[PDB]
Amino acid sequence: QDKATDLQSIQDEISALTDEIDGISNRTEFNGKKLLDGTYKVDTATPANQ
Amino acid sequence: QDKATDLQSIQDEISALTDEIDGISNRTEFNGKKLLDGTYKVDTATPANQ
C-alpha cells in the first residue's frame, strides 16, 4: 500500500518506542535500584555472575 | 466506403485512445502505487520476479 518513505515513518515511531524501552530499563529504579538491566539476568553462563 | 485518408483519421483517434490506455496504466497511482504497469505481472517466466 505504501512506500519505503512511509515504512520509514513507521520505523521512526518504532525506533522511538525502542528507545523508550531502553529508557524504561535504565531509568527504572526503586531507591536507586536499576533492575531491568541485564545485571540481574536469570541464568548467566557462569552462575557466579547471576 | 472510405479511403486510406479517412481510415487514417480513424487511426488518429485510435492511436490517441491507445496513448490514453498507457496514460491510465502509468498515471494510475494509489498513494503513489503505480499498479497497472507490468511490474506486478501475474506470472513471469521467473516466479522470483512476479
PDB file of C-alpha atoms in Angstrom:
ATOM      1  CA  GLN A   1       0.000   0.000   0.000  1.00  0.00           C
ATOM      2  CA  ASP A   2       2.728   2.460   0.973  1.00  0.00           C
ATOM      3  CA  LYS A   3       6.345   3.103   0.117  1.00  0.00           C
ATOM      4  CA  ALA A   4       9.703   2.891   1.850  1.00  0.00           C
ATOM      5  CA  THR A   5       9.182   6.526   2.825  1.00  0.00           C
ATOM      6  CA  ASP A   6       6.049   5.626   4.766  1.00  0.00           C
ATOM      7  CA  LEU A   7       7.602   2.442   6.102  1.00  0.00           C
ATOM      8  CA  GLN A   8      10.440   4.723   7.187  1.00  0.00           C
ATOM      9  CA  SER A   9       7.962   6.875   9.087  1.00  0.00           C
ATOM     10  CA  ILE A  10       6.673   3.749  10.793  1.00  0.00           C
ATOM     11  CA  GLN A  11      10.296   2.945  11.569  1.00  0.00           C
ATOM     12  CA  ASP A  12      10.699   6.381  13.109  1.00  0.00           C
ATOM     13  CA  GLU A  13       7.870   5.648  15.516  1.00  0.00           C
ATOM     14  CA  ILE A  14       9.099   2.121  16.251  1.00  0.00           C
ATOM     15  CA  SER A  15      12.678   3.226  16.852  1.00  0.00           C
ATOM     16  CA  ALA A  16      11.381   5.858  19.239  1.00  0.00           C
ATOM     17  CA  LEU A  17       9.456   3.153  21.062  1.00  0.00           C
ATOM     18  CA  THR A  18      12.601   1.035  21.339  1.00  0.00           C
ATOM     19  CA  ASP A  19      14.495   3.993  22.766  1.00  0.00           C
ATOM     20  CA  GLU A  20      11.716   4.223  25.308  1.00  0.00           C
ATOM     21  CA  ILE A  21      12.091   0.548  26.187  1.00  0.00           C
ATOM     22  CA  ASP A  22      15.748   1.122  26.946  1.00  0.00           C
ATOM     23  CA  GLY A  23      14.650   4.252  28.777  1.00  0.00           C
ATOM     24  CA  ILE A  24      12.386   2.148  30.964  1.00  0.00           C
ATOM     25  CA  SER A  25      15.066  -0.455  31.519  1.00  0.00           C
ATOM     26  CA  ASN A  26      17.608   2.137  32.627  1.00  0.00           C
ATOM     27  CA  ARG A  27      15.568   4.879  34.313  1.00  0.00           C
ATOM     28  CA  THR A  28      13.514   2.369  36.308  1.00  0.00           C
ATOM     29  CA  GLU A  29      14.902   2.483  39.835  1.00  0.00           C
ATOM     30  CA  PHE A  30      13.496   1.569  43.240  1.00  0.00           C
ATOM     31  CA  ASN A  31      15.526   3.600  45.719  1.00  0.00           C
ATOM     32  CA  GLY A  32      18.163   3.755  43.001  1.00  0.00           C
ATOM     33  CA  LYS A  33      17.989   0.045  42.176  1.00  0.00           C
ATOM     34  CA  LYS A  34      18.182  -0.219  38.398  1.00  0.00           C
ATOM     35  CA  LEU A  35      16.690  -3.683  37.975  1.00  0.00           C
ATOM     36  CA  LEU A  36      15.514  -4.270  34.409  1.00  0.00           C
ATOM     37  CA  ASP A  37      19.094  -4.022  33.199  1.00  0.00           C
ATOM     38  CA  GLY A  38      20.908  -7.245  32.443  1.00  0.00           C
ATOM     39  CA  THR A  39      22.815  -7.106  35.736  1.00  0.00           C
ATOM     40  CA  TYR A  40      20.264  -9.477  37.248  1.00  0.00           C
ATOM     41  CA  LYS A  41      19.974 -11.849  34.323  1.00  0.00           C
ATOM     42  CA  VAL A  42      18.150 -15.037  35.199  1.00  0.00           C
ATOM     43  CA  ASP A  43      20.922 -17.522  34.434  1.00  0.00           C
ATOM     44  CA  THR A  44      24.261 -16.427  33.035  1.00  0.00           C
ATOM     45  CA  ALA A  45      26.575 -18.997  31.521  1.00  0.00           C
ATOM     46  CA  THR A  46      28.552 -18.543  34.743  1.00  0.00           C
ATOM     47  CA  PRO A  47      26.233 -18.986  37.766  1.00  0.00           C
ATOM     48  CA  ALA A  48      28.650 -16.846  39.786  1.00  0.00           C
ATOM     49  CA  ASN A  49      27.692 -13.798  37.704  1.00  0.00           C
ATOM     50  CA  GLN A  50      23.918 -14.134  38.014  1.00  0.00           C
TER      51      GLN A  50
ATOM     52  CA  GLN B   1     -16.841   3.197 -48.221  1.00  0.00           C
ATOM     53  CA  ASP B   2     -13.953   5.495 -47.320  1.00  0.00           C
ATOM     54  CA  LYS B   3     -10.310   5.887 -48.217  1.00  0.00           C
ATOM     55  CA  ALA B   4      -6.958   5.495 -46.505  1.00  0.00           C
ATOM     56  CA  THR B   5      -7.235   9.175 -45.601  1.00  0.00           C
ATOM     57  CA  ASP B   6     -10.402   8.518 -43.619  1.00  0.00           C
ATOM     58  CA  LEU B   7      -9.045   5.269 -42.228  1.00  0.00           C
ATOM     59  CA  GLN B   8      -6.056   7.384 -41.212  1.00  0.00           C
ATOM     60  CA  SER B   9      -8.375   9.728 -39.340  1.00  0.00           C
ATOM     61  CA  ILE B  10      -9.847   6.727 -37.559  1.00  0.00           C
ATOM     62  CA  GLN B  11      -6.276   5.708 -36.794  1.00  0.00           C
ATOM     63  CA  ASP B  12      -5.639   9.141 -35.329  1.00  0.00           C
ATOM     64  CA  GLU B  13      -8.488   8.641 -32.886  1.00  0.00           C
ATOM     65  CA  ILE B  14      -7.482   5.059 -32.086  1.00  0.00           C
ATOM     66  CA  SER B  15      -3.835   5.943 -31.536  1.00  0.00           C
ATOM     67  CA  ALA B  16      -4.938   8.700 -29.195  1.00  0.00           C
ATOM     68  CA  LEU B  17      -7.017   6.162 -27.301  1.00  0.00           C
ATOM     69  CA  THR B  18      -4.012   3.853 -27.004  1.00  0.00           C
ATOM     70  CA  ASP B  19      -1.920   6.711 -25.653  1.00  0.00           C
ATOM     71  CA  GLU B  20      -4.656   7.171 -23.095  1.00  0.00           C
ATOM     72  CA  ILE B  21      -4.509   3.497 -22.143  1.00  0.00           C
ATOM     73  CA  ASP B  22      -0.816   3.850 -21.424  1.00  0.00           C
ATOM     74  CA  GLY B  23      -1.695   7.081 -19.650  1.00  0.00           C
ATOM     75  CA  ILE B  24      -4.070   5.172 -17.402  1.00  0.00           C
ATOM     76  CA  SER B  25      -1.558   2.414 -16.814  1.00  0.00           C
ATOM     77  CA  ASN B  26       1.156   4.858 -15.779  1.00  0.00           C
ATOM     78  CA  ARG B  27      -0.689   7.760 -14.135  1.00  0.00           C
ATOM     79  CA  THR B  28      -2.882   5.429 -12.073  1.00  0.00           C
ATOM     80  CA  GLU B  29      -1.459   5.524  -8.560  1.00  0.00           C
ATOM     81  CA  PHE B  30      -2.891   4.772  -5.125  1.00  0.00           C
ATOM     82  CA  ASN B  31      -0.713   6.718  -2.705  1.00  0.00           C
ATOM     83  CA  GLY B  32       1.904   6.648  -5.445  1.00  0.00           C
ATOM     84  CA  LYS B  33       1.486   2.940  -6.192  1.00  0.00           C
ATOM     85  CA  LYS B  34       1.628   2.589  -9.964  1.00  0.00           C
ATOM     86  CA  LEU B  35      -0.087  -0.780 -10.304  1.00  0.00           C
ATOM     87  CA  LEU B  36      -1.329  -1.362 -13.848  1.00  0.00           C
ATOM     88  CA  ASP B  37       2.248  -1.369 -15.090  1.00  0.00           C
ATOM     89  CA  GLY B  38       3.845  -4.717 -15.792  1.00  0.00           C
ATOM     90  CA  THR B  39       5.786  -4.635 -12.517  1.00  0.00           C
ATOM     91  CA  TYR B  40       3.101  -6.805 -10.938  1.00  0.00           C
ATOM     92  CA  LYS B  41       2.634  -9.213 -13.810  1.00  0.00           C
ATOM     93  CA  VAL B  42       0.617 -12.259 -12.854  1.00  0.00           C
ATOM     94  CA  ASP B  43       3.217 -14.931 -13.588  1.00  0.00           C
ATOM     95  CA  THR B  44       6.608 -14.082 -15.035  1.00  0.00           C
ATOM     96  CA  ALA B  45       8.738 -16.826 -16.512  1.00  0.00           C
ATOM     97  CA  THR B  46      10.769 -16.435 -13.315  1.00  0.00           C
ATOM     98  CA  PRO B  47       8.452 -16.666 -10.266  1.00  0.00           C
ATOM     99  CA  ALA B  48      11.020 -14.645  -8.309  1.00  0.00           C
ATOM    100  CA  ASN B  49      10.241 -11.585 -10.447  1.00  0.00           C
ATOM    101  CA  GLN B  50       6.455 -11.672 -10.102  1.00  0.00           C
TER     102      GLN B  50
END
